[PDB]
Amino acid sequence: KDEQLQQRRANQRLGAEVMSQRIREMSDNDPRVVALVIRQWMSNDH
């Protein structure tokens, strides 16, 4: 079980590291779109 948990953690830490790189390219493409989406998320949270 420990090995499976370690493999899952490595995949999470690899795809998230890829995800963090992915979110940077998108925000550089459109910085205001991310802020608008965040504001919409907060508005829907109400």
Binding site: S20, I23, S27, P31, R32, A35, L36, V37, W41, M42
Partner: protein, 319 residues
């Protein structure tokens, strides 16, 4: 969703988060700054699921939000003109008003605000000014007596912060005064309109009104005269008039003015000189690099003044 957004902003980086905050509203920016440093939660699955759902929820945000205000401004500029584009942009901006009356004070005319807050205590004036837009505050102090101006400026220099109760009291007071009052004085007809009106009447009445304005104020008369003939009707000037005016136009100043002019205007103005002179002017224009519009505008103004003087003398015509 706000906690997830704060976590994503924290994981993105300082520069990206700063840019997003600069592209975010005040309340949203404050909430994001508070929540991120306050309590941060990371979920192995829930955060990833939420991020995936957000990334797949719509493609609409990426395009419309990428260019919304710039496209509208460009459309307004290209549609009618610079003067009408400014009015359209002002109306669009005024469509989004402000709740607290203190900010509503900077949409008022400078003199109305100066008259409204002249009698107030100098510290209250100072408090209004740092909350008011800087440009407006400068105009207000310009209209203020020199003693009050110096006193309020000194208070501005050594400001020490307001009690929240006093600020709320001023806010509610100022709201009760401006929310009832109409706050959008429509300004239709300045000097462009006056020049257009003048240009369509008889010559004798034209000279009578311009000399009357000059008697009232020479600067207004000169501004009216400049708005009378802009640097766009030169295409309608006769070839003989262009040739006559070419004798008094400096080559460098003419080239600077025609660097940003329309190609049709340059072609029309290049048919009055010699072929060698036209080739030299074309070569100089091609070799001339980009320059600030401040000097080109001055050169065009000088050329227009020379042309107007020649026409007034009686050695030029139009067609």
């Amino acid at each position: 969703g706000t906690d997830k957004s704060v976590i994503l902003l924290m994981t993105i980086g300082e520069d990206r988060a700063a840019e997003v905050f600069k592209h975010l509203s005040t309340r949203e920016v404050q909430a994001l700054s508070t929540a991120m440093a306050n309590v941060r939660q990371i979920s192995n699955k829930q955060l990833t699921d939420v991020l995936s759902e957000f990334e797949q929820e719509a493609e609409q945000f990426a395009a419309l939000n990428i260019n919304a205000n710039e496209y509208l401004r460009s459309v307004l500029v290209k549609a009618l003109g610079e003067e009408r584009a400014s009015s359209l942009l002002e109306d669009i901006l005024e469509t989004r008003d402000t709740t607290s009356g203190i900010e509503t004070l900077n949409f008022m005319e400078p003199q109305s605000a100066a008259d409204l807050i002249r009698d107030e205590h100098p510290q209250i004036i100072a408090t209004i000014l740092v909350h008011l837009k800087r440009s407006q505050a400068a105009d207000i102090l310009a209209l203020f007596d020199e003693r009050l101006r110096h006193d309020v400026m000194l208070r501005i220099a050594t400001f020490g912060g307001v009690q929240p109760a006093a600020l709320a009291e001023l806010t509610e007071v100022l709201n009760g005064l401006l929310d009832g009052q109409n706050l959008k004085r429509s300004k239709m007809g300045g000097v462009r309109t006056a020049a257009e009106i003048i240009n369509l009447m008889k010559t004798q009445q034209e000279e009578a009104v311009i000399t009357a304005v000059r008697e009232f104020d020479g600067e207004l008369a000169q501004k009216i005269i400049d708005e009378m003939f802009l640097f766009e009707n030169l295409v309608d000037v006769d070839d003989r008039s262009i040739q006559r005016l070419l004798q008094e136009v400096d080559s460098e100043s003419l080239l600077i003015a025609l660097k940003g002019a329309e190609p049709p205007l340059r072609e029309k103005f290049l048919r009055n000189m010699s072929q060698r002179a036209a080739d030299i002017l074309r070569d100089d224009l091609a070799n001339r690099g980009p320059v600030r519009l401040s000097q080109v505008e001055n050169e065009q103004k000088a050329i227009l003044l020379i042309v107007r003087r020649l026409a007034e003398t009686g050695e030029m015509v139009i067609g």
